[PDB]
Amino acid sequence: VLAPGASIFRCRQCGQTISRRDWLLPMGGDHEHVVFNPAGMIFRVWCFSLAQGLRLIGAPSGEFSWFKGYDWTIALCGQCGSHLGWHYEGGSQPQTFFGLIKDRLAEGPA
Ligand SMILES: O=C1C[C@H](NC(=O)c2cc([N+](=O)[O-])ccc2C(=O)O)C(=O)N1
Ligand SMILES: [Zn+2]
């Protein structure tokens, strides 16, 4: 389609380019996963094969992982430090991917 308006995801706080609709990844059959952390925070997580503009913090941990076989690291916006989701590694098919918090991204035109 000409002039699409739902093609790129940016950080909601600062506008840093983060990912693309084209890179949505249907993990376990769905790109959306509704999950909670040990602090009880509920997230609507969209899985992406690739992302950019993030900064991954700390060492990978398997503890409390929402995706079996994957270890996670916190993914912050590399520009503003907003916590945008997690990077997953150490699994299979794919080895790595990103789980990003949908409401912390803004979707818009390329
Ligand atoms: O796959 C995953 C990722 C997620 N991780 C977290 O939410 C998390 C866990 C801890 N911690 O001390 O273990 C501290 C901070 C956070 C945070 O990201 O705020 C989770 O629980 N399962
Ligand atoms: Zn940001």
Side-chain angles (χ1 to χ4, degrees):
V1 308
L2 304 167
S7 81
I8 298 302
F9 289 94
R10 301 190 168 277
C11 175
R12 176 180 175 176
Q13 301 306 320
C14 77
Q16 173 59 48
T17 318
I18 304 295
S19 197
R20 305 181 82 86
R21 179 163 282 278
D22 285 343
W23 302 339
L24 285 166
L25 175 62
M27 290 298 298
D30 199 340
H31 68 246
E32 181 176 288
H33 290 257
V34 182
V35 296
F36 75 90
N37 73 5
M41 295 180 274
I42 295 170
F43 306 95
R44 166 178 164 234
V45 170
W46 280 25
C47 298
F48 291 90
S49 59
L50 307 171
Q52 61 176 108
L54 300 159
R55 175 170 47 102
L56 303 189
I57 304 309
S61 182
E63 208 183 15
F64 316 109
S65 183
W66 296 313
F67 299 97
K68 177 168 169 198
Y70 298 89
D71 309 301
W72 56 265
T73 53
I74 287 170
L76 305 183
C77 181
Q79 183 158 265
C80 80
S82 180
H83 178 202
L84 298 188
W86 306 266
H87 187 240
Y88 291 91
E89 63 195 292
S92 314
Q93 198 157 346
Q95 290 179 325
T96 68
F97 66 95
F98 293 86
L100 300 181
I101 301 158
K102 177 63 168 66
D103 70 0
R104 301 188 187 182
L105 304 172
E107 195 173 2

